[PDB]
């Protein structure tokens, strides 16, 4: 992690809860992450989005 390799949370787009923390490089990956993850709340895979840590 650095000024350019930032930390970030991923949020259930269906239930709005942040379920995973991870990292990315914002120079190489400027767009907000979107990943399918298991939502422990919604109990199924859900598209999750990068949301500010």
């Amino acid at each position: 992690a650095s000024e350019v390799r930032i930390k970030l949370l991923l949020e259930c787009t269906e239930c709005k809860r942040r379920n995973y923390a991870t990292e990315k490089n914002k120079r190489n990956t400027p767009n907000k992450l979107e990943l399918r993850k298991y939502c422990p709340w919604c109990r199924k895979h859900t598209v999750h989005r990068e949301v500010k840590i």
Binding site: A1, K7, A21, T22, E23, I53
Partner: protein, 64 residues
């Protein structure tokens, strides 16, 4: 004069029915983003303190 309960131990620890000493795993207070889920999950449990360390903490809790 009577002994005093050590409040820092009273707040961190519990003496189980058989007199083991139990506390939360250390190491997920923060700096957690790059810790695997196995790590965070396992640090979420209680553990039984090593005997010499537990016996010491027990004497701080004379009235539990």
């Amino acid at each position: 004069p009577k002994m005093k309960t050590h409040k820092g131990a009273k707040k961190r620890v519990k003496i189980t029915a058989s007199g083991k000493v139990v506390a939360m795993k250390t190491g997920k207070r923060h700096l957690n983003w790059q810790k695997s889920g196995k790590e965070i999950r396992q640090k979420g449990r209680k553990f039984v303190l090593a005997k010499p360390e537990a016996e010491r903490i027990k004497l701080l809790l004379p009235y539990e």
